[PDB]
Design a protein around this ligand. Structure first.
Ligand SMILES: [Mg+2]
Length: 63
RNA sequence: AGGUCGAUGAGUAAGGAAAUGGUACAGAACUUGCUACGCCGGUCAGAAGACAAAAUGGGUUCAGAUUGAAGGAGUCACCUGA
């Protein structure tokens, strides 16, 4: 191995001067990915009893 | 016999530019250069098979709930009632 990092290092790699473009690249859209949030239904209250439906624990009333 | 056009091609230099020369580019062989290659490895980033769950939003549509305004023989009427 060599340890010198010269400004001569890294610019001549295949990676800069060649791009393989032939694949389809899905474009970015500002108007889709913009919105996110959380809500809780009005019946959810801190410390309510919830009914576990699908859980390995389902059928159980929980806090 | 004569005259004329044509074909071959010395020349000539008008047009043009294939051959030669010159100039400019610059892609090569060369020379300087602590690098470019690939294989494997892990991380960062991009992308991500099949069946799915949740969330958000759009086109098409379905359902359940509300509110306001105008108009009515300025609807009709009702109450109090000689
Ligand atoms: Mg790798």
């Amino acid at each position: 191995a060599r340890g010198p990092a010269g400004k001569n290092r890294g610019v001549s790699k295949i990676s800069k001067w060649y791009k393989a473009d032939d694949e389809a690249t899905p474009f970015h859209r500002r108007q889709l990915k913009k919105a996110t949030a959380t809500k809780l239904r009005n019946d959810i209250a801190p410390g309510t009893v919830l009914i576990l439906l699908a859980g390995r624990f389902r059928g159980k009333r929980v806090v």
